[PDB]
Design a protein around this nucleic acid. Structure first.
Ligand code: ATP
Ligand code: ATP
Ligand code: MG
Ligand code: MG
Ligand code: MN
Ligand code: MN
Ligand code: ZN
Ligand code: ZN
Lengths: 356, 348
DNA sequence: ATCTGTACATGTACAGAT
DNA sequence: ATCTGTACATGTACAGAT
DNA sequence: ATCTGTACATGTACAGAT
DNA sequence: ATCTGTACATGTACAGAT
């Protein structure tokens, strides 16, 4: 009941969706068409909408959109980067429009992202229809972010991605454990879909920095978000409603509110809560464990689970099991205890941050 | 007890499956290669395996196989046949054939017969044409007899015809997303090859949805995991197997049941799977009740002379025009008997 | 004259609006 | 409840290319 | 255009555990 | 008696090579 009214606050307004989507789709279409023109290195690039807005778990406002510009790259050798599971060097063996980005048969991520970015930058200069600029490059981001002033502020992440149609890399063999939940036939089909490589683009200063790519499964996550039940009819018009997406929204919101206030929580992002809930959905596969009447206990067990990930410093990648998003090397124990305290406090005092 | 033991009988044997399959595959591959690799009117024909053996509901022996050779054909105009639902005249390589089903089936058939004469490593003949069949049936004699039905089909890639719009009522069982996806697939037209001497008989084709029934048979649960290695087993296919056995055993004995076929049983259980969508209503521990409630549904179809095409609801497979009222009363009394006496026919 | 990448045309699940 | 805008999958038309 | 290679679903068969 | 786990077999989807 309290949680029901929070979800009401979080609910997107169709009027805002129309105005935001109209602008966003103009700018994305124009950008996609420029990449196809002339001798462009990214001719053939294809669009793929991903992220919360296209999963229907975008909360508060339609003000951040994620778009993959995926490029199919045949004949690819992968070199795993120091057994991390998630990061790869990409190599060709043909000796090609990616020519300028090669580097001794190693594909440079930062060279390829720079050229990509320069093209976007130039195309944006030509838009005098809407108030759109390109954000200053943020480190770690595989994106070229647009800031649209639609009056209202709207971020768009154009994510550059390599597309391989081969079988997924062995580090993902034990990942995507949906057998007891969405089943083996779904798992086999999902894994026949391509996999993607986005540039890691770190600033750290470490070996291979500009040639390290990171795996991406936003397309699979989008499918799972929109086909999330053990029963084929979950949330359909002739089926029963579950509260799975609603729990994701409330936990996304707890993390946004907290991250808005405290800069201690910079290391944390929404993908942390998105990953934790895929694990919850696997742990509790049955649609009856996500009954809308038990929204409270469902939201509570998700916090209990998230709190155990923080304290034990373990949140495995859903697709790459050996990859721990809460490792010491990525997030300080300080940062984890701090967030643990803040969650425990919201939990046990009636979620006062839900009222700001 | 007893039903479990009957299903042990009806189970195919791994040995028999590989001997039948490798011989059937030799013949179908050669036939299929001829339809294109020799320049013929069916140059773009593609193979599509259908029926009980490929749905894993074939019983007793692997001795009947069903194959569609489907041919893509852009820009066909469909015309319904007297609001029958399932029968249509087709209009616009094929030039030699209003696209006449008889005329195309005959050449298709001529081509098969020619190739079968060039097969000197398999004992295989072409069965005499049955009016009423859209198939070219091959009789293969391994030490065992094996029927293969080669079914000619047109493949259309538009919307399904209006008569199906109320069909496939899987919304509360397999769901809306599955229904929309299935209905994005092509639909198929096969020949209506009856001898009845009625109006347009020779040019009429019949809708086929074997490709859709294959998916349903192999994606039949409300839960995605039904019958998977990390799911629960249901007894849905075993009920189909048993109801199929009962009709096969009766037809073998009683000439009066000639007008019945397994597709009646298959159609009835689709309706029951829609009426009872929950996987737990098909728990293996309730095989007897499930089989019995399927028997009672089938007897209620007979009593009321009503068994609508699962995909084409206004087509009543149990109409008077297709099956005589006497035939249905005859089958009602036979099933009611077997049911009330512990299925004697299951012991022979 | 025919071929074909691009975009229109069609249908509907999702979920916000009324 | 029903009505309705967006996203998205797939079929098809045709200007411009050949 | 056609074909092989790969992965894993669907099955059966049987022994050891229940 | 059934359940579980391994071995054995065929079907089918699609990537990549030719
Ligand atoms: N750290 C990450 N590791 C892997 N994939 C990530 C990561 N961050 C984001 N992604 C992928 O990119 C998508 C877009 O990221 P983004 O930060 O916009 O979050 P979101 O899930 O769309 O939600 P929101 O924008 O509302 O916070 C994610 O849904 C996920 O698929
Ligand atoms: N009367 C019919 N109307 C429509 N489709 C039919 C009809 N009879 C058969 N079919 C289609 O052709 C397929 C093959 O028919 P067939 O008689 O071999 O049955 P089956 O399902 O293969 O089972 P079995 O051969 O074991 O009796 C069917 O499964 C169905 O898709
Ligand atoms: Mg986002
Ligand atoms: Mg058959
Ligand atoms: Mn983003
Ligand atoms: Mn047949
Ligand atoms: Zn749901
Ligand atoms: Zn099942």
């Amino acid at each position: 009941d309290k949680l029901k009214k929070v979800l009401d606050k979080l609910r997107l307004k169709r009027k805002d969706i129309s105005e935001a989507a109209e602008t966003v789709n103009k700018v994305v279409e124009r950008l996609l068409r420029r990449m196809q023109k002339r001798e462009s290195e990214f001719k053939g690039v294809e669009q793929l909408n991903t992220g919360s807005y296209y999963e229907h778990v975008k909360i508060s406002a339609p003000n951040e959109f994620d778009v993959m510009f995926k490029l199919e790259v045949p004949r690819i050798e992968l070199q795993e980067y120091y057994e991390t599971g998630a990061f790869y060097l990409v190599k060709f063996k043909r000796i090609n429009p990616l020519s300028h980005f090669l580097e001794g048969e190693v594909l440079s991520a930062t060279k390829m992202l720079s050229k990509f970015r320069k093209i976007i930058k130039e195309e944006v200069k030509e838009i005098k229809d809407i108030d759109v600029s390109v954000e200053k490059e943020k480190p770690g981001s595989p994106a070229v972010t647009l800031l649209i002033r639609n009056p209202e502020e709207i971020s768009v992440d154009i994510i550059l991605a390599l597309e391989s149609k081969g079988s997924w890399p062995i580090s993902t063999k034990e990942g995507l454990p949906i057998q007891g939940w969405l089943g083996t036939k779904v798992r086999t089909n999902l894994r026949r879909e391509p996999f993607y490589l986005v540039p890691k683009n770190a600033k750290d200063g470490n070996s291979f920095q500009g040639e390290t790519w990171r795996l991406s499964f936003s397309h699979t996550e989008k499918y799972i978000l929109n086909n999330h039940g053990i029963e084929k009819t979950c949330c359909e018009s002739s089926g029963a409603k579950c509260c799975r997406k609603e729990c994701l929204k409330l936990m996304k919101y707890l993390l946004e509110q907290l991250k808005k206030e405290f800069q201690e929580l910079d290391a944390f992002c929404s993908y942390h809560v998105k990953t934790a809930i895929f694990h919850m959905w696997t742990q509790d596969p049955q649609d009856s464990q996500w009954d809308p009447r038990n929204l409270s206990s469902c939201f509570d067990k998700l916090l209990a689970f998230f709190l155990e990930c923080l304290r034990t410093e373990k949140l495995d990648h859903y697709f790459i099991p050996k990859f721990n998003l809460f490792s010491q090397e990525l997030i300080d124990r300080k940062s984890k205890e701090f967030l643990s305290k803040k969650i425990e406090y919201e939990r046990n005092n009636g979620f006062p941050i839900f009222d700001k």
